[PDB]
């Protein structure tokens, strides 16, 4: 894992996150791609940004943590772009994805738990 891919989830929190991602795909509460993710942030509709630690060169993602801090949106890195893209429901790598808001789903409540876990990593 690239040391700039911080905070970084373990394999267990990773599976949890990817499960939430796959729920979001099914609910159509998911945007894939770094620029697609940026756009959700600037609209104020992201609930969670997930990035891949094995994105090379990782520099192309590094504006995203800063944007998320500006917008008060949680983010995390998972170790593998291949696994992230599987979770997103596509057969290609995904280096960043964004869960978007929906007031009638359980996603926000799961993200709240995930945030607590990420904060325990810190």
């Amino acid at each position: 894992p690239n040391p700039k891919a911080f905070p970084l989830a373990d394999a267990a929190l990773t599976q949890q996150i990817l499960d939430v991602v796959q729920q979001a795909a099914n609910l159509r509460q998911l945007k894939k791609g770094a620029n697609e993710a940026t756009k959700t942030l600037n609209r104020g509709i992201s609930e969670f940004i997930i990035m891949a630690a094995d994105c090379e060169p990782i520099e192309i993602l590094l504006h995203l943590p800063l944007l998320c801090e500006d917008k008060n949106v949680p983010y995390v890195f998972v170790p593998s772009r291949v696994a992230l893209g599987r979770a997103c429901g596509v057969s290609r790598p995904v280096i960043a994805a964004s869960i978007t808001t929906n007031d009638a789903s359980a996603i926000k409540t799961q993200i709240y738990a995930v945030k607590d876990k990420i904060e325990t990593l810190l």
Partner: peptide, 27 residues
């Protein structure tokens, strides 16, 4: 390398202040 250690440190501080469920307590 020292660049990356500082990046991590600053990311930690800003996650606690700007994003955390318990950010008031971290503030």
């Amino acid at each position: 390398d020292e660049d990356v250690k500082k990046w991590r440190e600053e990311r930690k501080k800003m996650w606690l202040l700007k994003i955390s469920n318990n950010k008031q307590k971290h503030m």
